[PDB]
Amino acid sequence: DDIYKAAVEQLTEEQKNEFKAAFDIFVLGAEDGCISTKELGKVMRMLGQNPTPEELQEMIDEVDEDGSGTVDFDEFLVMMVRCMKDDSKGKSEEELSDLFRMFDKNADGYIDLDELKMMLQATGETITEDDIEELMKDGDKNNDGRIDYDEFLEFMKGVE
Amino acid sequence: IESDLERAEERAELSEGKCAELEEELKTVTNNLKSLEAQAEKYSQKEDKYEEEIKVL
Amino acid sequence: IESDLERAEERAELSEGKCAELEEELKTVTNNLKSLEAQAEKYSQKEDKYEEEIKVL
Amino acid sequence: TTALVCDNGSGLVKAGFAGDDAPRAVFPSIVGRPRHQGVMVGMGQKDSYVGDEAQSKRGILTLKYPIEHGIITNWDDMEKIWHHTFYNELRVAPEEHPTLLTEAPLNPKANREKMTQIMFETFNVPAMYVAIQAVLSLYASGRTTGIVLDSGDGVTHNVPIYEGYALPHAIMRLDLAGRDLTDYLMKILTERGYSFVTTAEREIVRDIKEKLCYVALDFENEMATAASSSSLEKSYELPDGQVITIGNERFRCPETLFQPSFIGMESAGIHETTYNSIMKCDIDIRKDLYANNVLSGGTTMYPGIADRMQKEITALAPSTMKIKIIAPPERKYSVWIGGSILASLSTFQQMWISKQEYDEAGPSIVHRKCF
Amino acid sequence: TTALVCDNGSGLVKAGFAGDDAPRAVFPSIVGRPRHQGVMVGMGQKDSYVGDEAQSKRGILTLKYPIEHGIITNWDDMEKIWHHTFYNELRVAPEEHPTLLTEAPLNPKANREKMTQIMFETFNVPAMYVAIQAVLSLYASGRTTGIVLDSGDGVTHNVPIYEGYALPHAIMRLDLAGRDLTDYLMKILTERGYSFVTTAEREIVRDIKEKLCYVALDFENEMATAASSSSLEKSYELPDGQVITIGNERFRCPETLFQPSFIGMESAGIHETTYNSIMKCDIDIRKDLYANNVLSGGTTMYPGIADRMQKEITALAPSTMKIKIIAPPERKYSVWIGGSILASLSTFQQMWISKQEYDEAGPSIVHRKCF
Amino acid sequence: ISASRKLQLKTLMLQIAKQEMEREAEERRGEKGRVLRTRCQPLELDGLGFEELQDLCRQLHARVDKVDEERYDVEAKVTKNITEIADLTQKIYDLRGKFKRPTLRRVRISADAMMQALLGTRAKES
Amino acid sequence: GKRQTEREKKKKILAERRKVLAIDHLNEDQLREKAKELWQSIYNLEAEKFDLQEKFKQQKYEINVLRNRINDNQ
Ligand SMILES: Nc1ncnc2c1ncn2[C@@H]1O[C@H](COP(=O)(O)OP(=O)(O)O)[C@@H](O)[C@H]1O
Ligand SMILES: Nc1ncnc2c1ncn2[C@@H]1O[C@H](COP(=O)(O)OP(=O)(O)O)[C@@H](O)[C@H]1O
Ligand SMILES: [Ca+2]
Numbered sequence A: 001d002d003i004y005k006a007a008v009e010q011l012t013e014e015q016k017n018e019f020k021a022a023f024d025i026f027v028l029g030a031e032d033g034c035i036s037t038k039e040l041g042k043v044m045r046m047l048g049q050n051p052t053p054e055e056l057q058e059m060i061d062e063v064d065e066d067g068s069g070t071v072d073f074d075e076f077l078v079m080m081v082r083c084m085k086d087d088s089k090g091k092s093e094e095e096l097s098d099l100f101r102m103f104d105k106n107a108d109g110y111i112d113l114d115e116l117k118m119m120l121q122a123t124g125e126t127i128t129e130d131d132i133e134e135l136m137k138d139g140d141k142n143n144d145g146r147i148d149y150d151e152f153l154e155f156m157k158g159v160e
Numbered sequence B, C: 001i002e003s004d005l006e007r008a009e010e011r012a013e014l015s016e017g018k019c020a021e022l023e024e025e026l027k028t029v030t031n032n033l034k035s036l037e038a039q040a041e042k043y044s045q046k047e048d049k050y051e052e053e054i055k056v057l
Numbered sequence D, E: 001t002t003a004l005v006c007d008n009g010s011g012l013v014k015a016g017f018a019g020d021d022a023p024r025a026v027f028p029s030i031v032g033r034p035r036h037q038g039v040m041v042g043m044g045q046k047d048s049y050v051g052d053e054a055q056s057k058r059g060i061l062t063l064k065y066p067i068e069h070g071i072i073t074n075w076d077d078m079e080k081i082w083h084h085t086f087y088n089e090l091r092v093a094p095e096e097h098p099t100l101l102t103e104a105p106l107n108p109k110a111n112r113e114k115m116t117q118i119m120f121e122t123f124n125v126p127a128m129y130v131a132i133q134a135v136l137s138l139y140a141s142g143r144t145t146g147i148v149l150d151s152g153d154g155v156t157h158n159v160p161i162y163e164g165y166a167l168p169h170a171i172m173r174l175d176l177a178g179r180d181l182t183d184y185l186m187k188i189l190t191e192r193g194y195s196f197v198t199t200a201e202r203e204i205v206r207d208i209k210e211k212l213c214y215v216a217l218d219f220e221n222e223m224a225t226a227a228s229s230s231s232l233e234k235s236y237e238l239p240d241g242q243v244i245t246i247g248n249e250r251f252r253c254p255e256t257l258f259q260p261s262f263i264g265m266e267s268a269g270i271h272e273t274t275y276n277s278i279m280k281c282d283i284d285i286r287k288d289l290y291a292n293n294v295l296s297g298g299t300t301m302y303p304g305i306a307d308r309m310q311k312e313i314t315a316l317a318p319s320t321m322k323i324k325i326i327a328p329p330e331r332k333y334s335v336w337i338g339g340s341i342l343a344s345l346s347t348f349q350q351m352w353i354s355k356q357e358y359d360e361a362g363p364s365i366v367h368r369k370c371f
Numbered sequence F: 001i002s003a004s005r006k007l008q009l010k011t012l013m014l015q016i017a018k019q020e021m022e023r024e025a026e027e028r029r030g031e032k033g034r035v036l037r038t039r040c041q042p043l044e045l046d047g048l049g050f051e052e053l054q055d056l057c058r059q060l061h062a063r064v065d066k067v068d069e070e071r072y073d074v075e076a077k078v079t080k081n082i083t084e085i086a087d088l089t090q091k092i093y094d095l096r097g098k099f100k101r102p103t104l105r106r107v108r109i110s111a112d113a114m115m116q117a118l119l120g121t122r123a124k125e126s
Numbered sequence G: 001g002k003r004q005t006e007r008e009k010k011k012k013i014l015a016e017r018r019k020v021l022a023i024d025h026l027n028e029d030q031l032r033e034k035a036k037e038l039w040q041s042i043y044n045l046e047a048e049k050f051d052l053q054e055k056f057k058q059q060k061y062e063i064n065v066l067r068n069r070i071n072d073n074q
């Protein structure tokens, strides 16, 4: 996952150009010009193995997560690193619990808007208020200003 | 839509529970009011009787 | 599922309205009960004084 | 530090820190092991659900109260209940808090001694004190005299007190209480077709009793009215549907209090054991006891009992005395409120049974000066 | 290593490695010896075609299922089916893989003991475990309560479960299933002129039943409509031409499920044995069972059954309870998906019947603690 | 906007949180050293004859016994707390498990293996 | 029973933890060495107690979190 991007980080999007050339070797002549990886994977399968389109559906759905219907090259990278994962789940969940304890300095068991706001301020991340509310609702799933350990894990699920 | 339906159901259940509790409370307090009113009427009658007794004695 | 969700939410709204009305009734009856409790205490004091005077007479 | 005012009771354990108005955690005292086999693996099934958790899974449990009539019959379960009360409902370790248990009058000594031994050895409290359940209910009323009828769920006892001097020869303890009324209601419901047998369905019958039953002002007139009209039949929805209609079972269940011959008990009702308890007192404090009759305990919450009892006592008592029945709205928690008041007093702060005293005299210290 | 989640079933053997979404190989469980003489020499004609191979040469075979009603009636054929499943459809030797068979409730003991003896002696697996076919279907739904109606092809059984505690006294096993519906359809097709007799043509009637039949929402209205209009007559092409037209046989074949008097069975339909199975449960878990009724098994795939069953139960049940019928789209493989989930659990990893344990106690180990 | 950019931002947040945790651990170890220096009375071992050394060793052994009793009591409390934590964690897991079991399918062959098989050795990244 | 049996077991364990101190056969230098050993043992006990206190605070925090999660479940 991360090793692919790390070994290609010093390079530009030409990795996707090479992937496009490889697809042209197999599925040259795309019509939509949009996100389409099911067809190329199916053509790869058609070389004699057992037909299975569920893997293709999973790969073609791993790209779109924002819900806007658009699939970026960064979304392609996310799909590539999520179909094969080695150091996922934020490494160790015990360290995640330690970080959540750092978040809950009041030790009340509920992260409020104050805790998340101060933690993001310490990070200093420049994210718009829309993304602020998105992250809040991802954490505060029931949307009542309180975030427990389970909500913290869900908010940081697949986050490392 | 299924998740939305579940949320609606739980909200309705909570509201009905609170309604039942309020009904019980109102019943109890109204019974108390009725009993106290009967006692007050009897007390007025007793007070008049006591004043009559004071006069005659 | 959509139709069921809509009906459930309407039920919840109706129950909330009923709960508000019950709250109003409860507070009103509570105030009336307190007033009558004070009245009964006055009754008790009157009876005490009348009893004492009866004994003296 | 603050004191823990626990109150074991029999049917509802009421606990909370000293100095408040209401107990912090009130939950039934039942411990129910599962009875079926269980096929799902890894579901995290425990071996005993205690307290309010076993009132939600009661469909597959066999609930059994650890306190029968005031006395404690199953010490392991009672220890489990206490452990739950301390650690999960209050979340305060007992190593740093005095405790004030409550005990019915005329109970076996061994029960009290075992209670203090448990509190000092297992939970290891700093100091504990055991108080009679009626003196506290007299504290809560703000009186200092009066004869208190504390009709709990296990046992009904009637302790007269004057000017702070309890009269030990006039305590009349009767073992009819809420549990026997539940059993009698469950037994007379069978006259319409509804059969409740399982120990879980006893809870349903208890709910029926709480929500529907009331004490009749005059028994024969109500029996005649319910047999002609149908203005009394109130319906109730079981936990699964199939509504039931209770007729003259409504006022026949709590009538057992005033006629214990219904459940075969010989003794006289709670209307006549109070008068007998008064008549055993001296001739000069009977007027004050007549005027300050106090009701407490859960079972005295039936709608219309404070009038029936007054009518009965006025019938028994001499015509000149004034009969007054104190029935505060906070009847159920009266004992615990009184316990909080007593634990909050400065004069009482040196009556606790300190641990070093127990180490020197053993568990039999409770019968000694530190009562 | 990985576990083999086999599922014998009766009609379709479903198998695959633990931890996947769908069984790897699904094929009918039929073993058919040839019946004619055979004149070509050296054609390589075998003596018994099993599995999906005998559904292509069925024109000259006599197919015979080795499992009649859950129980296994012909052990040699069942051994042949298992050998085929292990070696040719999965190509994994059983010497290096645990197995998880499935068995209907209330089956004869000897069947289960012989199954474990075969698995340990002939195929020589490391460890095997036998599980009830309904608990798995409850696993697959992701629930932990609910009453599951697993109407397979051999036998329909209805196991209620609450909070992971199965209720052994409320299992209602009924022997009407897909095979009897196939026979009844083959028997009512004769009313139009089409006669299917050979054991090979039973497969054709099964295909007709799968592709055309549906469960009517209201039976009498459909019987009246099909007798006046002709909007229901759907045609179907036999394996050789000569299309046939099915009229009101479409919804009369699967109606046998709700009225087993059609095939002469006395018992009540699957709409009333579920309600009876619920009513045998305790009074406090009936609401949860009402709300979490689960369907599984192949035969519950008829178009329109999840509405007919809900209507029937709502008619029977009290008006206040909510009746909900869970009908996942992956109904057919629900038992096997649940089996995969159960075999993939870490908590379950020590429940297997290890071979040394079998060597010490014999085949009767299965009835013991390792259930 | 970008999913990879969001993952990068989350990684940076993780880095900041880890740095704060490391700072907390350094503070904890420094406080541990300071409190250990404060509580442990220093060893005044100059100009002392045999008898006072014997008395000091005996009193130190007694104090060691006392502090050992206190530490053992705290260890028992910590063991009880961690047992309760494990019990309640399993309780929450049961209340938030069931469907949380791993639904994973091996029919999805890893894209790295597929690329290696179909391209030999000219696909080295995957 | 068990509670007083637990007390007796605890006090016996503590007595075993009390090491047999015998210095009536050692020179004053050895006495100082043994005193240093005792002080290092007390230092180890203090460090262990402090670590137990920190982990107990952590456990209290996790217990509070678990209570909040249970409240979420209700
Ligand atoms: N509102 C009520 N109406 C009638 N009976 C009640 C009511 N509340 C409680 N009870 C009865 O009182 C019992 C509880 O009594 P309680 O005072 O808790 O006993 P204890 O002295 O052991 O605490 C219950 O078992 C119930 O039968
Ligand atoms: N799509 C369908 N529509 C109607 N009936 C079906 C369908 N699929 C299977 N069946 C019936 O279900 C049976 C297969 O049931 P199955 O669940 O495989 O039984 P088992 O429990 O032995 O695996 C077949 O014999 C067929 O009669
Ligand atoms: Ca997008």
Ligand SMILES: [Ca+2]
Binding pocket: A139, A140, A141, A142, A143, A144, A145, A146, A147, A148, A151
């Ligand atoms: Ca929240």
Ligand SMILES: [Mg+2]
Binding pocket: D009, D010, D133, D150, D152, D153, D297, D298, D335
């Ligand atoms: Mg009481």
Ligand SMILES: [Mg+2]
Binding pocket: E009, E010, E133, E150, E152, E153, E297, E298, E335
């Ligand atoms: Mg099946």
